[PDB]
Design an enzyme around this catalytic site. Structure first.
Site: not given
Length: 270
Positions: A108, A68, A125, A63, A37
């Site tokens: 990334h 990435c 990953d 929570r 998210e």
């Protein structure tokens, strides 16, 4: 920070020895419970602290999910604390082309992991989103590599490798990387760009994902999707309240940690 809490977040019951199978199990259960998210960067809350504390407080205590640098940040600290050797890598996402498009920024990050008696280095990953790999991958080119979902493959490129997934009887290129170890500071620089530059997709739109036994769930704005064996089921959700219910109910995000849920719908409608 505190493994007990990370294990009870993702509800991990298994061995904790730095073996391959513990690596496989942790990845599956991590993927299954901590979503991708970008709600922080979307609402003007950058991601520039990639310390274990910071990342544990958000993805474990609070929570929440993360993108990435947060995912592969938290996984990296977990594997190191268990006795794995973790080298962090940078990558450029080229998924879905075009070639007419400019080179992406290195925004990334993934991991190269070794452990005792390992057959070499494994790629890990858990931060690529809906299409992230679901099994550790031996870092070798050509060889087609089975996963718990679709099979993946690495191929050589000039001075690098590319990670491919078999999606719909087509090998699809996800991203390109080198195995140059990237220091924390450079990942901070990349994540700062990812979560603050006004042309970044993580500032300009909503992306979420979570992975299950038999499906890959993706949300892109108000458009939900589930990729299964029988193809992909799509639906465009009604109002801002539908999207906020989807994140809470189907992605499991603690949306109350972003203030009153009735006060968050307003931001999304925009």
């Amino acid at each position: 920070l505190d493994l007990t809490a990370y294990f009870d977040r993702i509800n991990y019951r298994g061995a904790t020895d730095p073996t391959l199978d513990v690596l496989q199990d942790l990845v599956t259960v991590h993927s299954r419970t901590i979503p991708f998210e970008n709600l922080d960067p979307l609402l003007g809350v950058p991601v520039d602290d990639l310390s274990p504390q910071a990342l544990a407080d958000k993805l474990v205590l609070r929570r929440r999910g993360g993108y990435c640098f947060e995912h592969n940040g938290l996984m990296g600290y977990v594997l190191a604390e268990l006795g794995y050797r973790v080298r962090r890598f940078a990558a450029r996402v080229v998924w879905k082309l075009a070639p007419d498009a400019p080179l992406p920024p290195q925004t990334h990050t993934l991991l190269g992991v070794t452990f005792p008696g390992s057959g070499g280095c494994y790629l890990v990953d858990v931060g690529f989103g809906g299409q992230t790999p679901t099994s550790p991958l031996r870092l070798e080119t050509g060889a087609v590599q089975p996963t718990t979902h679709e099979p993946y493959r690495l191929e050589d490129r000039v001075d690098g490798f590319v990670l491919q997934a078999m999606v719909r009887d087509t090998w699809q290129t996800l991203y390109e990387f080198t195995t140059q170890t990237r220091p924390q500071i450079d990942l901070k620089v990349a994540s700062w760009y990812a979560s603050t530059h006004p042309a970044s997709k993580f500032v300009t739109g909503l992306t979420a994902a979570v992975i299950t036994d038999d499906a890959r769930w993706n949300l892109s704005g108000r458009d939900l999707a589930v990729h299964r064996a029988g193809g992909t089921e799509k639906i465009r959700l009604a109002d801002a309240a539908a999207v906020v219910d989807t994140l809470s109910e189907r992605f499991g995000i603690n949306v109350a940690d972003i203030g009153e849920r009735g006060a968050l719908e307003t931001r999304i409608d925009e």
